[PDB]
Amino acid sequence: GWSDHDELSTDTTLHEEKFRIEPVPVHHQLDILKIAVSENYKTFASVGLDRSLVVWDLRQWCTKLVLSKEQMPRTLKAIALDPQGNYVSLFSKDTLFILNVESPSLMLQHSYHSKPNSKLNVFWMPGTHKDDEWKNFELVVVESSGEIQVFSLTIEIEGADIALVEKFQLSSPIIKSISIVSPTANRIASLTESGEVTVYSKKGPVWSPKILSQNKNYLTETKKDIYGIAMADILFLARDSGVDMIDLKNDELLHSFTLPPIKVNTFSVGVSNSRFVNGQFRVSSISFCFTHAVTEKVLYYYYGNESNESYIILNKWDQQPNLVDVHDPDNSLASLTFDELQENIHEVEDASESVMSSDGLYIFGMRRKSSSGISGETQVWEVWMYSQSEKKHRSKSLKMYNSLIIADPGPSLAVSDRCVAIVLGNYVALVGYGSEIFR
């Protein structure tokens, strides 16, 4: 543990009781550098400054794989999990390693060209899997250089095989790449220093590129970020006076949200209560998180009247009308236009590390208020939450007696629609509201 003991006030309402913080029971010997979670939110990984790795089953509260610094390659350029949280891919400067985390073992090791000092982003995408017998994946490796490699990875009970199947080269360096595993296609989207976003999409056996268009009213703005909601087949392109929300299936600008200038690479999106009804991807709310390029403050913009009330149609399979007479679970609800969305803004003080839940409905944060020597030291932290839909803030004071934490909090990542992980030096805290993750 991170202290001799922690002290909190006893809860006086059921609402307070549901607001929870707990330490993850495992930790690293040096500060945590990087954290990640699988797409299905089952599996969490943390990587220390010393390359140590811990992979953790969130719902079962147990360790799946722990590797110390001396059990790891001496270089580690990237980590990634498959979308189901059963495999991890680790990349050193010259080697990739594929581990089974469900039944721990090394399935495969493969040597690979990297152009160091090349920065890597790695993504798993489903290929032609099915079922419990064998699985196929595409493993995509993106280099800041503009190089994109795609590997076909087959996994079996026994072991695995891999092959470099495609290689692409972009005309500019890559600021940011993302994967979109959509219902229509596997897609890789890259924002380059040119300001272009190039999307490579797979149809059948063949990848093809397209260059996306931002809102033509705003062509001189610097492009700052891209972010995808893969199941809606939507890409968000952030620039300096807003964000363009683009349908990648039918190639179509759906809306431009108005925002202040956004700091490069700091933008994310969550949407709530996602359901698909008669060709419509519907959500109850949309939330954006970004760092304001002027004030360097972290901001949360929340749009919507919330669930019990209305919904927003984010995208449609077919951008045509359709009088299908089928079951519509949202009958008693109002469909809203983009222009009649209500916008609520929450700005966070620099002192806090904050992060929103995966559906954008809750913001959580932590700040160290104070510390004092015992002759070790005692620290007072504030743990807080904000419910974006009820407009309700809650905070708990957390006193740590003989704390072993000397770092400022961060980095941080959503772990479910009601729970977040916040790094505290070499520990991680889970903070949530009414979350089944506890405990």
Side-chain angles (χ1 to χ4, degrees), residues 1-129 132-374 376-438:
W2 54 30
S3 55
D4 287 358
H5 67 270
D6 290 353
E7 166 197 318
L8 295 86
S9 294
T10 302
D11 298 314
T12 68
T13 78
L14 201 74
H15 306 317
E16 292 177 338
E17 190 178 325
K18 292 189 312 161
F19 182 28
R20 294 288 297 279
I21 169 162
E22 300 289 344
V24 161
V26 173
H27 61 83
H28 291 255
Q29 249 63 55
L30 276 256
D31 277 0
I32 293 164
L33 180 57
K34 218 260 176 162
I35 56 170
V37 73
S38 54
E39 224 96 61
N40 68 345
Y41 301 101
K42 175 165 88 82
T43 302
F44 182 84
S46 51
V47 179
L49 293 171
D50 59 354
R51 302 168 306 267
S52 42
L53 195 246
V54 177
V55 1
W56 173 259
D57 192 293
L58 258 2
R59 297 315 168 100
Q60 295 188 30
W61 284 73
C62 58
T63 301
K64 297 175 156 228
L65 206 206
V66 174
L67 296 168
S68 59
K69 169 190 173 204
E70 295 84 18
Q71 294 156 346
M72 283 287 286
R74 80 159 229 80
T75 57
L76 214 222
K77 289 197 145 207
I79 180 179
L81 289 96
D82 84 286
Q84 287 308 297
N86 299 315
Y87 303 100
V88 190
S89 53
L90 298 178
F91 284 71
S92 64
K93 67 185 163 196
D94 57 29
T95 318
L96 79 90
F97 307 91
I98 303 303
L99 296 126
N100 186 324
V101 288
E102 223 50 71
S103 312
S105 58
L106 213 218
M107 310 293 283
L108 174 153
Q109 177 179 334
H110 190 85
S111 296
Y112 82 95
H113 280 295
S114 242
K115 340 308 176 210
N117 313 70
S118 202
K119 266 66 199 215
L120 297 199
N121 197 14
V122 178
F123 316 114
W124 291 66
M125 306 182 89
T128 146
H129 105 270
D132 323 65
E133 275 164 32
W134 58 285
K135 308 180 183 328
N136 191 241
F137 296 96
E138 295 177 299
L139 226 198
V140 180
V141 181
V142 182
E143 289 178 64
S144 37
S145 77
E147 217 137 1
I148 299 169
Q149 309 178 40
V150 1
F151 292 91
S152 177
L153 174 58
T154 300
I155 292 185
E156 295 193 53
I157 308 99
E158 321 88 65
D161 286 300
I162 201 174
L164 195 254
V165 282
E166 291 281 13
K167 187 156 190 179
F168 313 130
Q169 175 61 39
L170 266 48
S171 312
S172 176
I174 289 175
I175 301 172
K176 168 69 171 259
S177 59
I178 59 174
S179 90
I180 310 207
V181 177
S182 101
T184 293
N186 291 343
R187 307 192 204 275
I188 307 287
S190 314
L191 170 60
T192 54
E193 293 182 9
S194 333
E196 306 164 279
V197 19
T198 296
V199 183
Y200 275 93
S201 304
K202 213 213 206 319
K203 264 296 165 102
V206 186
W207 292 85
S208 55
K210 266 216 275 286
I211 313 284
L212 265 44
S213 318
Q214 62 156 106
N215 186 319
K216 29 281 117 194
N217 279 318
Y218 303 104
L219 287 161
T220 72
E221 299 190 352
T222 309
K223 276 56 96 48
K224 296 297 193 61
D225 216 344
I226 57 177
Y227 189 90
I229 312 262
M231 48 180 28
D233 216 352
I234 284 169
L235 183 138
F236 291 81
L237 193 246
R239 45 185 173 66
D240 268 334
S241 61
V243 184
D244 299 323
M245 180 174 87
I246 298 169
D247 170 16
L248 269 359
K249 177 185 185 297
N250 305 308
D251 214 354
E252 192 121 347
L253 177 61
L254 298 155
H255 188 64
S256 295
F257 292 80
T258 304
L259 291 173
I262 285 164
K263 191 164 168 45
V264 66
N265 256 306
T266 64
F267 183 83
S268 62
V269 181
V271 301
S272 77
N273 292 334
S274 282
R275 66 277 202 182
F276 184 94
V277 179
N278 187 17
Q280 297 180 349
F281 192 104
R282 304 175 179 168
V283 305
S284 297
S285 66
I286 311 175
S287 298
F288 300 145
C289 179
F290 64 88
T291 301
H292 197 297
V294 181
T295 59
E296 297 263 3
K297 297 285 192 269
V298 179
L299 282 285
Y300 297 85
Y301 278 53
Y302 173 82
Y303 307 89
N305 311 14
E306 179 51 0
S307 158
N308 177 4
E309 257 153 285
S310 50
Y311 62 90
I312 298 158
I313 293 162
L314 273 193
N315 196 9
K316 298 204 277 163
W317 196 265
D318 290 303
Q319 300 281 357
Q320 69 122 352
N322 193 355
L323 310 180
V324 187
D325 176 6
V326 289
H327 184 242
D328 190 328
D330 298 306
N331 45 79
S332 309
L333 292 197
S335 194
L336 299 172
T337 64
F338 291 125
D339 308 336
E340 68 211 358
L341 280 165
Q342 329 219 94
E343 146 193 309
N344 288 296
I345 300 173
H346 181 74
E347 172 169 32
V348 174
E349 67 178 337
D350 234 275
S352 282
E353 174 66 2
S354 74
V355 51
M356 69 185 181
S357 65
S358 53
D359 63 3
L361 285 183
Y362 296 95
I363 312 164
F364 301 96
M366 289 194 69
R367 38 185 285 260
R368 189 200 325 101
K369 288 193 270 183
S370 72
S371 55
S372 220
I374 302 157
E377 58 177 276
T378 289
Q379 296 164 355
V380 181
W381 295 76
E382 176 201 18
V383 196
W384 55 264
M385 57 160 301
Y386 183 71
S387 174
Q388 308 223 61
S389 71
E390 315 162 333
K391 305 155 106 249
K392 183 55 197 286
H393 197 273
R394 264 188 249 284
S395 64
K396 294 193 172 181
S397 186
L398 185 174
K399 178 193 274 213
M400 298 185 182
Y401 186 78
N402 208 24
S403 177
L404 278 33
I405 296 154
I406 46 286
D408 286 348
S412 62
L413 198 65
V415 103
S416 83
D417 290 346
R418 295 180 214 145
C419 198
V420 103
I422 295 177
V423 169
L424 269 15
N426 54 319
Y427 298 89
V428 5
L430 268 21
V431 184
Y433 191 72
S435 175
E436 296 173 9
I437 288 175
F438 299 100

